[PDB]
Design a protein around this ligand. Sequence first.
Ligand code: JY8
Ligand code: JY8
Ligand code: JY8
Ligand code: JY8
Lengths: 259, 259, 259, 259
Amino acid sequence: MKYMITSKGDEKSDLLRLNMIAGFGEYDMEYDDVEPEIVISIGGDGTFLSAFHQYEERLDEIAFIGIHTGHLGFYADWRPAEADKLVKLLAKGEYQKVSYPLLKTTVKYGEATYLALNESTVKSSGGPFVVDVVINDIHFERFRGDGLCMSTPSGTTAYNKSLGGALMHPSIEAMQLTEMASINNRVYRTIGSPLVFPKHHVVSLQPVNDKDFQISVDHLSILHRDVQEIRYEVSAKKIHFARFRSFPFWRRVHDSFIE
Amino acid sequence: MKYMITSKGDEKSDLLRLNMIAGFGEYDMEYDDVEPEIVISIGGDGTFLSAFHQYEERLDEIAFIGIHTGHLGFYADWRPAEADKLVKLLAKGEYQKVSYPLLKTTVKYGEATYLALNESTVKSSGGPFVVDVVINDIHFERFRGDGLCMSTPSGTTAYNKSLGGALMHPSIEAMQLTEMASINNRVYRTIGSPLVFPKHHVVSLQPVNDKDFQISVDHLSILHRDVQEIRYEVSAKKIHFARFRSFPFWRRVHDSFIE
Amino acid sequence: MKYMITSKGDEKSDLLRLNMIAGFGEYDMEYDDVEPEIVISIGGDGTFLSAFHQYEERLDEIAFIGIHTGHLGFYADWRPAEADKLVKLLAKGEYQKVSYPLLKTTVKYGEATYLALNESTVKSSGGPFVVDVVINDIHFERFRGDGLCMSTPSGTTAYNKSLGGALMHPSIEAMQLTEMASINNRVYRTIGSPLVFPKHHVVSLQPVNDKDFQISVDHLSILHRDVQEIRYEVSAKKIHFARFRSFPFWRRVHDSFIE
Amino acid sequence: MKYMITSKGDEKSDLLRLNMIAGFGEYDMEYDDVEPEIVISIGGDGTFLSAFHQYEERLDEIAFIGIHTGHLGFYADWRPAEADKLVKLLAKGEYQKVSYPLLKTTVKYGEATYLALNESTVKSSGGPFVVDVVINDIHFERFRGDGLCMSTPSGTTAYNKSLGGALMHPSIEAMQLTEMASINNRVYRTIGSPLVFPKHHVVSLQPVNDKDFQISVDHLSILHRDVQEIRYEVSAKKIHFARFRSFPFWRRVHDSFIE
Ligand SMILES: CCn1c(C)nc2c(N)ncnc21
Ligand SMILES: CCn1c(C)nc2c(N)ncnc21
Ligand SMILES: CCn1c(C)nc2c(N)ncnc21
Ligand SMILES: CCn1c(C)nc2c(N)ncnc21
């Protein structure tokens, strides 16, 4: 089975990577980083994030796995001491696949599409940030503040959580919008609460004055110029995970934030 | 078609009720408050809440409608001037049915089940409130504060919203838990963020010291004694609405909070 | 020097109390719980709270001290192993006095005054809670929600903190009001932010419909009937602490919440 | 009396400015923008902000006034129709002076000091933002998030309010720190609550990895490189306002946010 392994780059991860390659070397397991079926990431959730974007083109052909050499990550939920258990279980299968929803981000000018595993945010380049929020072609509010954040279900535990958003189970195919330091007075008015949109709901951001935005998708962030509208909706593509055990989402939330 | 009409009790509502009964009196429309198929509520969302609980037994046999004689309610979303339009459209049908999820609340002692349209809350009778939160038979946290609130999707715009929870579209079959003034220090630790649970997820509250709780379901609130566990999960029953127009949920959110 | 010692009542505290009485028995130290000059509390901050209210009449004649037999309290900031150090330093003095502001609460009917070290809260007895907030005889807002909380500076780390309020240094003679789950829509409007009032500013709560309120002062909470107005203002009396060391307020905040 | 008038630059403001200059032209009132005693700003609070920074050198020699040609500002609290009332009352005096606290910001490298009327914020240039927060030379926390904000009392109604901070009366000589989207998990830990520091308390921010920060003071924001520490403390200088009427701070808060 075609596979590849990305590493965080430090001593702990590169050496654990060479051990698994030697472990797979005892099986009928071909290494390939062009068209792999199993993508293993070793490091942290940030390392897993780059592994997902490296192969965002053939998501349906890949099952992702993550080893955390630091603390317990949400996508990297395998201890290094369990790596040899992993190599043996990958050899044939009998494992199952688990799929999480994704977020499609479309940006039109005078058109680029992105796929986000965690979240996508919008901020203003330099000056004030004012956008008209449009939900299913109906004007909902005029936002003035620092920015907005649209999050995937599994991405709610990251930036979405720091902004007051709700943590939602990844079996729910939905997206969640949150606000950043919005102004609310007798002039400007925002909803304030986080909003959870289902499949087939389109959230569109339209500029009011300035047309340049600092848009981010996960940990890649590039300034866009002459933006006409930013379009958010739950993607039709899903990321596929290889499951060998029973690690519930709420147990991962408990271990990361409670204890 | 069997129907009944509840009124808020004031001058504006009782007179609008007698007009619709006379309007239905010109059609093949039988009045019945024992086994109606169409339940019309005139007043506010609180009046709609009592209309739902009056007939929570045969929810699948009923389609609810609401007229707001005050401000725009979320369940009562028909202007009084549109009442004659309503009477004519009820006469034959051609309308469609729209269903929202509900919340089942089970209370065991040393067992009562409830159905909630908005939310169900738990508080302590007098003294401190300490409960162990159990998600799918796994201990998640020990809550110490004022109380907890489990909300339906359509109920997120009410008490759930005042507690910082997210507003989620009612097409999502889910429930949302929020916290009330929880203590978080170097001793006690709660998640803080709101939690959104899908279907078939069971949230269970277990007492630590005191066993008496002030439990509420919508606007009915009764003290319970010798409680063993409180069990929350998305109900299998759904409330059915009669739709004649296109009033999206986000448009109702906009009119109630933005403008 | 006249002194008395209250204990939490458990094994750890009563035995530490008898040791200090024997320690003071070797000095010119008279025990008196009628008119003491040094009030020592052994247990937790709740034990200190009762010690303060036991002698709220002669606050200016007393210097309070607190030993924490559990975790680090904010008022009980002496380890039990440092009790013998305490007994020796109390013997003559050379210690200094540190004063914190207090909160006066006046309740008028058709008049009772209270002194609060932590906070004073207002809630509704059973039904909805609606009060008109009046600041310096000027109407500021109409609050509809669960309740309000007026906190002392040193009391900001308690209930005030759980409600989102700011932690303010106790050298600032001020009070802080916070809200509990307020309703904000296109009908009702509250400020939302916590408010910090200086000396000589009077905050007055006036009923709108119901006239019965569940009013609390620290950990004593009694239902009041036929209430005309609740009046909050920074008290002119101050609680006096005996200081022997340098334990800054921000260091106490750090040890309790950070580590 | 030496005076000058800045204008927002639009039609409404420049024409109201020329009327007041002609109004002062009938009195013994000399126009001077080098060393004025009365600085009049016409426009919004942002126009007042630039008027303050234009003359931040001789604050003790100046009394500021503000006319709002748009909506009710907090510093610009005079209606344009009351401009002729203003010109007459400035002619001799009989008015009184009202002083507000300020925020001193010191930035050391391998030293620049600033004066802020609203707030001063810190953010990271590009990458993650990690700073060690030091209060009175004692380490308090390690902050990881989007940034921090230190606000003046009168500046609490601006950016400080959007971040959840408390609105505090400007008669209190203090500063308030608030957090922006901080990460809190089983690894990183921040206090979360806003902190209110009195006079003579020094808050110091120290870098952990990156040493470049985007620092702002009111509406001027410049990237700093090779930063050793950022030092916040309540300034010894105060801004002086000319008062002719009784417009309480809480009445200004009410008119801006409630109604
Ligand atoms: C900042 C580290 N991190 C990343 C890269 N993804 C996540 C995530 N889903 N939840 C929590 N923390 C996360
Ligand atoms: C307090 C009035 N009210 C009721 C009874 N239900 C709701 C609701 N779903 N959303 C908003 N307000 C509501
Ligand atoms: C609930 C325990 N507790 C009491 C009784 N006072 C306090 C206080 N000022 N800060 C924190 N916790 C406190
Ligand atoms: C953004 C407009 N604005 C300025 C420039 N100062 C303030 C202030 N103190 N309170 C509210 N709004 C403000």
